[model samples]
Target: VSPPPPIADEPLTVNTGIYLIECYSLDDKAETFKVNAFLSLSWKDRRLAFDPVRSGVRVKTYEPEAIWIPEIRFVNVENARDADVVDISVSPDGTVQYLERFSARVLSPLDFRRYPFDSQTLHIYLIVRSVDTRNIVLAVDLEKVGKNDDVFLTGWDIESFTAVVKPANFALEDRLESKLDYQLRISRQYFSYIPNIILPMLFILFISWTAFWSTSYEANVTLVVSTLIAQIAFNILVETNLPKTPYMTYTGAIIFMIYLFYFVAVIEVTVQHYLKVESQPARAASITRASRIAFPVVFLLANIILAFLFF
Candidate 1:
């Protein structure tokens, strides 16, 4: 079927709306989110107009195959939508209402610069191409756009799902396209990362620093080496939970910085051992005492600077 003919030199305005049912499986690694929602469309088709009393029916239901349905596509979708046509009803005035329950895996890039403490605005773009007859333009029907309370994503606090309301009309590939933007705001649960990932990491780093308080040769070797190994363990585990970002994250910087401390701890241990062996016990004792305060104070200060820079 073809688009309905226009009476004037004007484009057909397609009123669009989204009612989100559920949002789940937000993948940090894949940079995608699975969404289930009702996509609604409304437009006037004067060719379908009929007299209510003459037809003896106020509304008529019909399949999309018999009507001129505007082709709408998702701009940021990873795959074609798994859509179920729920309804297509026409009023006596030829006003058509279309609804489809669609599930899509949408691709949206996320900024991991702040990582576990990050806030994100995920986007969903809907586009309609202007084909034959009058060009088609999309408009948000605010009365029909919103999410259900049951929409949820694990480890994320969903703030809002709102439409821009204004359609962005731009030319693409020699054809005008009307685009609508939908935004989903979310923030990570900071507490989950602090206790499980950051605190345990800090404890292992502090354990490595404990070697600076001792003058024993063999025991200092064991303390620094074992704790360094433990820190590497957490590093590998942390990497599994995150995507490999081109730019460094706040937690990534902190985790990487601790290795330098570990290496220096090894250096301090070696220096103390050599000095003691050379029968300079007094000098070795002084160096070890200085390292006791220097390592921890510098570590705490560095953390403050890192947090301030990121937050």
Candidate 2:
């Protein structure tokens, strides 16, 4: 039988845009082989996918020397094309795997410039034709290497590599102005939680309005006060969580209406209360028929005019 070709000691550089993988092999025994690989360089750091805010850690800050490493794993020659390495997984103990530190470099160059939330994952394909032959492949999972500080290769690294290079740059060419696209994102958990606070206040405001047409002055005043305090507390809470911007958020606009309505209700209640206190108060309610029309007109006009622009 013919022996396999002696293909060893020829280090090659494959540029995959995200990073460059330097591949080489050191030793080969009769019918056996061992390959070594390393990654050189770092780009912008990306946050983990599960992070709440659309954010990425600075690759330069945390891993200035070694952060652009791509996530990789072993794949047989038959299935190498289907494998898209998402991350590396390594144990704290001494381990030897592609998912381990600095053995093979994974290159990811795109998404350095996009919003951290917008860019977190990468896709790659390596086409292989033969499986029966010694079709060796490398594994460099980010999940494992990211946890370790080792930046060099060691031993008879058995991983073989054919880096199908995909050039990507994950850097924002221009600095984003905080005003134009200042997107301060929160966790989906927290962002979804906003409506919970908002919806209940809406119901409470509805309760406040229920007393609007009722003749029971005391009931009207009680509900108004309850809604008022709620709105104030709610407004404060939202402010604490959100960044103060020159333009109001859609959610902020909705909240402002809630507070404004509660305040208006308070004024109505105070006026009624004073009228009741006066000994010579007229038989007519202080809030006359004209005031009824004026109140809604003002609210509608204000909201219609402001809502169009703010939103």
Q: Give residue 195's lDDT in candidate 2 (0 to 100).
A: 63
Per-residue CA lDDT of model 2 for 1-311, tens digit only, reads 21122146321111121222322321111111122223222211112223323334221122212222422332212122222333332222211112212332223222212111122222233211212322222222332221112322222222222232322222233311110000111111234344667467666666777654654667877877877787778778756744455554555676667667667767776666566677423532546344456556776787687657653
CA shift of 104, model 2, Å: 19
183-274: candidate 1 lDDT, tens digit per residue: 99999878877788888988888787788777777998998898888888888988887898889898798887798888888888998999
Model 1 global lDDT (CA atoms, 0 to 1): 0.91
Measured by TM-score, the strongest candidate is 1
Count clashing pairs, candidate 2.
23
C-alpha lDDT of residue 82 in model 1: 94
lDDT of 2 at 248: 49
The deviation in Å at residue 226 for candidate 2 is 1.0
